[PDB]
Design a protein around this nucleic acid. Structure first.
Lengths: 173, 53, 49, 157, 228, 205, 132
RNA sequence: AAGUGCUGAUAGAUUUAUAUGAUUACAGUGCGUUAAUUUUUCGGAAUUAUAUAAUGGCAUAAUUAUCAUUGAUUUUUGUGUUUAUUAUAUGCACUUGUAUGAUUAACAAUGCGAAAGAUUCAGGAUACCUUCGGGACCCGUCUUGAAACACGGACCAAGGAGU
RNA sequence: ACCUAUACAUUACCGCUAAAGUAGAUGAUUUAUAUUACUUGUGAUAUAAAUUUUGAAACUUUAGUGAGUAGGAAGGUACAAU
């Protein structure tokens, strides 16, 4: 999908020896509503006793990050399992939206390390301003004025004629 | 998806839209683009495309 | 109720070009003036109880 | 922002012009106050003057099973699925010849050297503008690669 | 009385007159005319309407059972207005450019050539066999001489032989195509009045000598997805 | 001529990739096609030369052992390196897919009328739309020479023959357009002449 | 001249082709008239693809139009004249074929008598024989 | 979520409902109070009281029962209130009207079962030949498993085995 | 996006399986009309025409449903005699 962002809150349903059990919350990136509510329990079966049903999911909501046209560079903290090899990482991407730079992580982490997305865990995601971004492929996209004449298209192959007539001479200068 | 033309225009890179809008009219793009030397050759889109019967 | 909406939105063209209103859309709204009498009877005939 | 499309794209019916839901231009013109109205670039094949050309190019096959009820065509210019969605419902015909006449000129003068199997295009097939057509009988498959004539009649506009 | 109120067809699920018999009714003094005619009566004085033994009987012959009646419902015509220049897709005039004049109660299209111009009479074509171009030809004060009815112009007829009843025949009769002498008076009426119109147009693509050539299209253009 | 398009579609093989031009042509030839691919010594193969050396040198050791004459006949032209492809992509064991290679004539060194007839480019199979920077390619020109094609310099001299008289037929035509642009002057006062075409073109005046 | 019956139906058919008995192409001993194979490794009994097709009740024709001839009628073998008097008022569902046993002598009467009761005989011009 | 407002196409359409049981209940059209209001003036058009429990709305009483309890949610309602909404108060005739009896029928064209004589339109892998496409191993048997590098079988007619 | 099964679905047809209905026809039922009791109104009577068997081992209605060796049961079918 594209990994929207949620804030999912727990309960430990309130049995009589203790009413009002203490309401923990998470920050979950999942493609959909209901899979966000089951990451929550996989990440509750490590920190609190608390399973379903011994617990509840009190109000979650999908959140809609704050500035969708600022050009912030995210820095995510990560934990992932290899073939033999559960490892911490720390990765950085440039994106307008937070859930766009967690899904930027997955398709990159999954390619570069083979990393199937059930063995990746997000352990922090924050915007990191500048002059803290390490990660050389970010901090070359910093310096205004950035000239960069990569004459770029997809250059749609080829066009509406299969047997075209015109020999498309890319450069056009 | 986007192809490039011969027209730079000056802003800061942190510009809000209102001052791009200020700059977009000030360097007078609107009149010199509809005479750009193959922006006439755009206008088979307005004349040779579907060119009714 | 959707009928009166398209009645109201074609009268948005009477903001724009103000054309007619000859036998087509004022006649759609002229009946309201005769429907005013329902409220004009409401001041004289609904005061019976 | 996208509120305009409940206004701007109704202007086609004041470009009809009938009952004018939006009298705005989007005039498709060269005016610098006009860079709108969304022309999809491009495809320009006629071969549709009348009898739009098309081959017959196989049955509605699976891999290893054939379903000769339905033909698969290949229209002369059509290249994506909005193109071959035009021809659906048109009485396609496959025309060929035979040695016999065996018959008179009964209605307007008939020589009978030419055989036609009439059909009707039914639906779209490809993701790129091929098309299926159920015929009257069933297309003998040495007709694969031979031309059938998609008609232009019965025509929506 | 009054209050028709049948608002059926732009909704398309309402009528709205169950709201009428509320207070509108007199609910009393019910007197009505109440025809009670026994006139369908076999009062064979000399009348003899049994009916008599033509048969009244069990002569045995069997044919189907009876035919539930579609009547002339609505006819959708897509938007062709008189007189839009047409292109014809069948019927001895295929490819000729013609001008419509009238859309009739049979849901068809009256079409003139002009027969003077295009050799096409006031024949009658469906909306299925025709391709309506973009814009109009102005016909603001044309009379459209309404005795040109659809019902007015069958082939009249094949009386199975010459109205005498039970008669003889040789093959190859010509009883269907004069063409009608009155029709030649209606043809010279329109093609007089149409030709004063159609030369006064701005000669665009289809106004003056501009009908007269045989549709088969050309480069850089369409059957697929045109602004046609 | 006249056909489903013409009775030919002439394709230059220059600068195209060998197997993407094959599966375009073997699909189009089953549509009822008639192509005629020329300059087959110029088809580019991907990978460098000692990749495709080894692969053509492995396809020739596949010969029958009982009797080698029956075994795979390994044709060594460039135009038969390519015709071998368009048989892997065609049902050649059927009477349908044997008439589909009998529309295919394939030439190497552009002869005899396919030198005046307009020949077209298949941009889906061009090299410089497909293959990256840094990536070496080959040509089937040198592959067939290094596997025994005895006519490489035959056709290179025949190319320079028809390259040489192309300059004679362009200098017939370069000045002839220069006559047209002078012939275009005398017609600007024809009657009302050019106005009806220029009001829909005008971008070429 | 006989009117086809009782305002005829449209006789439509699952297979026209008749079922033709495994390996009868291969052997001259085997008649083409169907046998169900019983034998174990048999791909026709097992209903493999592109082998042929067996009978079953699923190909059974419409119960209205079952045994109806091309003419909408149903047969009735007539063997002498006073069997035609059975078809005096069944001449509107049934039709007669004169048997093969019935000779040329009597057939001339059966044909003439069945012209009066308007039945549609399905083989007149049998034993004509414009001869002795 | 609402029909919101539709526009396009596709395939299909049982029925001898008496060849031993509604074609009728529905609704829809065409005649017989009223009065002003309006509009076009050629229609239409609108209007109240006409009888509801009134259901929704408001106020209030009242009580059942509760997330949490300032409260909210009700529950039984009841009254008052006006704001709306809905249904009932269309018989007598008469239609080629719509529905419903596994909801296909109106319009035309083409063609004459034609005295014997004889064409038109559809169909016919009947049992083959011609042309293509797709599928497609040889049966019987024993066997866990047979196309088997398992056994029998060259072919054909007669005979031939649960009494 | 799209292609693809003997699966899913809606329809026609074949069988199966399970239910359900019909037999006073010197009766039932229409359409009219004469008369009528009249209850305003609807029935009952006379006339004229009309429809109304089925190997009830039949006919009509409705729904689901269909793999099969070895194997068992039903219904047909070929041969020849009394």
């Amino acid at each position: 999908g594209l990994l929207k962002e949620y804030e999912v809150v727990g309960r430990k349903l309130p049995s009589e020896k203790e009413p009002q059990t203490p309401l923990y919350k998470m920050r979950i990136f999942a493609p959909d509503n209901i899979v966000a509510k089951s990451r929550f329990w996989y990440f509750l079966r490590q920190l609190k006793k608390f399973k379903k049903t011994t617990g509840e999911i009190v109000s979650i909501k999908q959140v809609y990050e704050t500035s969708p046209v600022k050009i912030k560079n995210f820095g995510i903290w990560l934990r992932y399992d290899s073939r033999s090899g559960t490892h911490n990482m720390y990765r950085e991407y440039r994106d307008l939206t937070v859930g766009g730079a967690v899904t930027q992580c997955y398709r990159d982490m999954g390619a570069r390390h083979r990393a199937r997305a059930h063995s990746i865990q997000i352990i922090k995601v924050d915007s990191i301003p500048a002059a803290k971004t390490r990660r050389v492929h970010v901090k070359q996209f910093h310096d205004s004025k950035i000239k960069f004449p990569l004459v770029q298209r997809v250059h749609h192959k080829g066009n509406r004629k299969l047997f075209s007539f015109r020999k498309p001479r890319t450069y056009f200068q | 998806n986007l192809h490039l033309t011969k027209y730079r225009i000056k802003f800061p890179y942190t510009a809000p839209t209102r001052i791009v809008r200020k700059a977009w009219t000030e360097s007078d793009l609107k009149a010199q683009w509809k005479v750009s030397p193959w922006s006439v050759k755009a206008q088979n889109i307005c004349k040779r495309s579907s060119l009714n019967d | 109720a959707a009928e009166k909406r398209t009645v109201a939105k074609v009268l948005a063209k009477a903001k724009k070009q103000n054309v007619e209103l000859a036998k087509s859309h004022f006649a759609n709204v002229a009946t309201k003036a005769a429907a005013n009498r329902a409220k004009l009877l409401a001041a004289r005939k609904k005061k019976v109880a | 922002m996208a509120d305009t499309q409940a206004k701007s794209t109704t202007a086609p019916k004041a470009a009809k012009a009938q009952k004018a839901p939006k009298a705005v231009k989007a005039p498709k013109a060269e005016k610098p106050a006009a860079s709108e109205a969304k022309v999809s670039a491009k495809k320009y094949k006629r071969h549709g003057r009348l009898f739009a050309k098309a081959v017959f190019t196989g049955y509605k096959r699976g891999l290893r099973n054939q379903h000769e009820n339905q033909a698969i065509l290949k229209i002369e210019g059509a290249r994506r699925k909005e193109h071959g969605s035009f021809y659906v419902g048109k009485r396609c015909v496959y025309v060929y010849k035979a040695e016999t006449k065996k018959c008179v000129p009964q209605h307007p003068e008939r020589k009978t050297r030419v055989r036609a199997v009439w059909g009707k295009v039914t639906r779209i097939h490809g993701n790129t503008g091929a098309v299926r057509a159920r015929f009257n009988r069933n297309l003998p498959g040495h007709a694969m690669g031979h031309r059938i004539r998609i008609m232009l009649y019965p025509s929506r506009i | 009385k009054g209050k028709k109120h049948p608002v059926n067809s732009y909704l398309k699920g309402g009528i709205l007159r169950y709201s009428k018999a509320q207070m509108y009714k007199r609910r009393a003094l019910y007197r009505l005319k109440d025809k009670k005619s026994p006139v369908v009566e076999k009062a064979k004085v000399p009348i003899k309407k049994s009916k008599a033994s033509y048969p009244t009987k069990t002569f045995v012959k069997k044919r189907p059972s009876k035919a539930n009646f579609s009547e002339h419902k609505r006819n959708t015509r897509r938007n062709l207005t008189p007189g839009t220049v047409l292109i014809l897709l069948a019927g001895r005039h295929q490819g000729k450019r013609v001008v419509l004049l009238k859309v009739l109660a049979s849901g068809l299209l009256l079409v003139t050539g002009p027969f003077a111009l295009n050799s096409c009479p006031l024949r009658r074509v469906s909306q299925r066999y025709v391709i309506g171009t973009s814009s109009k030809v102005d016909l603001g004060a044309f009379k459209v001489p309404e005795h040109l009815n659809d019902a007015y112009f069958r082939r009249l007829k094949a009386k199975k032989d010459k109205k005498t009843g039970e008669a003889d025949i040789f093959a190859a009769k010509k009883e269907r195509f004069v063409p009608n002498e009155q029709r030649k008076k209606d043809q010279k009426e329109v093609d007089a009045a149409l030709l004063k119109v159609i030369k006064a147009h701005p000669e665009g693509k289809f106004f003056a000598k501009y009908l007269q050539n045989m549709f088969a299209l050309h480069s850089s253009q369409y059957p697929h997805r045109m602004r046609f | 001529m006249t056909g489903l398009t013409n009775r030919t579609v002439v394709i230059d093989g220059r600068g195209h990739l060998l197997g993407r031009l094959a599966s375009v042509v073997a699909k189009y030839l089953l549509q009822g096609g008639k192509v005629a691919v020329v300059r087959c010594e110029e088809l580019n193969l991907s990978g460098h030369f000692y990749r495709n050396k080894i692969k053509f040198l492995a396809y020739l050791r596949k010969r029958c052992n009982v009797n080698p004459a029956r075994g795979p006949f390994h044709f060594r032209a460039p135009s038969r390196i390519f015709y071998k492809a368009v048989r892997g992509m065609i049902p050649h064991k059927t009477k349908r897919g044997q008439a589909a290679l009998a529309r295919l004539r394939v030439f190497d060194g552009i002869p005899s009328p396919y030198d005046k007839r307009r020949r077209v480019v298949v941009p889906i199979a061009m090299r410089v739309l497909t293959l990256r920077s840094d990536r070496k390619y080959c040509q089937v020109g040198r592959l067939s020479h290094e596997v025994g094609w005895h006519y490489q310099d035959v056709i290179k001299s025949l190319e320079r023959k028809r390259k040489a008289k192309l300059r004679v037929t362009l200098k017939h035509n370069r000045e002839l357009k220069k006559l047209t642009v002078k012939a275009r002057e005398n017609i600007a006062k024809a009657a009302e002449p050019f106005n009806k075409i220029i009001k829909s073109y005008g971008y070429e005046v | 001249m006989t009117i086809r019956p009782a305002y005829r139906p449209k006789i439509v058919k699952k297979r026209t082709k008749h079922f033709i008995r495994h390996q009868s192409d291969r052997y001259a001993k085997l008649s083409h008239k169907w046998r169900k194979p019983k034998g174990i490794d048999n791909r026709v009994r097992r209903r493999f693809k592109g082998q042929y097709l067996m009978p079953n009740i699923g190909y059974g024709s419409n119960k209205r139009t079952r045994h109806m001839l091309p003419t909408g009628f149903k047969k009735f073998l007539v063997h002498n004249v006073r069997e035609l008097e059975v078809l005096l008022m069944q001449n509107r569902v049934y039709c007669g074929e004169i048997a093969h046993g019935v000779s040329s002598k009597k057939r001339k009467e059966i044909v003439e008598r069945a012209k009066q009761l308007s039945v549609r005989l399905t083989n007149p011009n049998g034993r004509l024989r414009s001869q002795e």
